[PDB]
């Protein structure tokens with residue numbers, strides 16, 4: 452059934468990842484993954500608040516009014532890799548990994564997410580912008596990166612910008 456999840460060793464990692472520069476607000480400009488089946492989606496934002504212990508408080512803001520989804524990313528072995536904090540709260544989830552594949556900190560990021568639940572491996576990549584719009588070249592780059600990971604046209608979606616919720620606080 453599912454497109455096989457790539458190994459974390461085959462997914463790029465941002466070299467010399469800078470947790471201080473990555474912090475703050477990012478807009479989800481596109482999304483691709485093996486559980487993405489394009490039938491678009493309303494843009495949501497994700498705020499990475501860096502803690503003293505170098506974990507992130509990660510708060511996503513979505514349009515339903517507004518929904519907030521709050522979780523913690525705990526640093527893993529390499530800079531730019533994370534696991535999901537408080538795993539006991541997600542009883543479906545056997546493992547969960549986050550990897551910042553590429554970013555220039557002030558414009559865009561591409562982040563890889565993988566999780567195992569129900570003995571099935573899901574993965575997704577997100578195209579983040581510091582604004583709600585990114586260049587055609589960056590959106591093309593994202594598409595080609597998704598396809599390099601075995602994803603198809605049906606698995607790749609770009610979002611519809613909004614001013615509701617996603618700019619809150």
Ligand SMILES: *[C@@H]1O[C@H](CO)[C@@H](O[C@@H]2O[C@H](CO)[C@@H](O[C@@H]3O[C@H](CO)[C@@H](O)[C@H](O[C@H]4O[C@H](CO)[C@@H](O)[C@H](O)[C@@H]4O)[C@@H]3O)[C@H](O)[C@H]2NC(C)=O)[C@H](O)[C@H]1NC(C)=O
Pocket residue numbers: 500501502508
């Ligand atoms: C990242 O995420 C965590 C949330 O999961 C967050 O840590 C939490 O912050 C809140 C707010 O500071 C803490 O709540 C306070 O805890 C202190 C000490 O135990 C309490 O005294 C506080 O009580 C206030 O309200 C009371 C109401 O009766 C008043 O009487 C009192 O005067 C206070 O005003 C309040 O409960 C909470 O304990 C932590 N939780 C954890 C697990 O650390 C952190 O701030 C976030 N960091 C960010 C966004 O940068």
